[PDB]
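TODO from last week: model Blo t 19.
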Amino acid sequence: GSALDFTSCARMNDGALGAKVAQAACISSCKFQNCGTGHCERRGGRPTCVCSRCGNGGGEWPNLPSRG
């Protein structure tokens, strides 16, 4: 489909205003999928919306912590 964005956080590169739109769009979409929050993260040059603290999936582990 002819769309301006495929990801909620594409606007992250639309200036400071875009940053707010990006984060807002991201956070909202995350909540809808049962995620505590959302933040715009760039992956492979791609400005993607990544949800943090999700019910099923966790979030992220860059340092890789312990289990318990």
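Done. The first helix runs from residue 15 to 32.
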